[PDB]
Amino acid sequence: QDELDVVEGMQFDRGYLSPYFINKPETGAVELESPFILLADKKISNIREMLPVLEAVAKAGKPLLIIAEDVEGEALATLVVNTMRGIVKVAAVKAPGFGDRRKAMLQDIATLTGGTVISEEIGMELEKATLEDLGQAKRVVINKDTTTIIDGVGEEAAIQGRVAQIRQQIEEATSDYDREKLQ
């Protein structure tokens, strides 16, 4: 039979970087309620650059979702260990897309969630990132396949402005693949 599968908001195809982030085992998925979102343009392998952010998140008490180029090694292991220990309900995933599109999708997620993307080109550093810098969303569901953010706490005027910018990019575009990715 013909089936229809509709997904709202962001559902970019990136799953949990570590299977042990699963909060709900019977569903095999991470479920975060009202979590912060830390959007990092760089790839991270050490916990030092993020330690202030994790400490602030633990002080706040709410969960945290990391959207990054790659979290691996010491940083990933420390995040996972903290996940069991329960100090911070932290889940990490790869940023979506590839070069020159990963940044755009990260910025759209930032606009949706009312956050800011941490990058070296922009100038800010992760050691100086704050809770206000971190984004906010009402719910988050990660699985091995896809990451979904539900009701990102972001300005509607900003979301429409970003949508209009992407529309202008679609108009400027002359490639079917480029315009369908923009859409």
Binding site: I47, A56, E74, N82, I87
Partner: protein, 96 residues
């Protein structure tokens, strides 16, 4: 019992910090080996060119910041890890 010779010191390294300042558990490279350790024994003193032995400024039972390197040597006493290093290698003794 082990007590050192000349300008040297026996130091039991302090346990690595399991958690960070804000309560974040540190693992692997994050929980780096501590550079601070208590002094278990103190040597008689360094020998100067004239042949006299000067007592060391390090005392027994005080915490000391020490530098890991070629000078420091790892040893086991009563199945406990200790380090042996010259008083020059000892950066500073911690007070309070």
């Amino acid at each position: 019992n082990i007590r050192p010779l000349h300008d040297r010191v026996i130091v039991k390294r302090k346990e690595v910090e399991t958690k960070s300042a804000g309560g974040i558990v540190l693992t692997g490279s994050a929980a780096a080996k501590s550079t601070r350790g208590e002094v278990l024994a103190v040597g008689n003193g360094r020998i100067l060119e004239n042949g006299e032995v000067k007592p060391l400024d390090v005392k027994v039972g005080d915490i000391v910041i020490f530098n890991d390197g070629y000078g420091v040597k790892s040893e086991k006493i009563d199945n406990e890890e200790v380090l042996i290093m010259s008083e020059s290698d000892i950066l500073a003794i911690v007070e309070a």
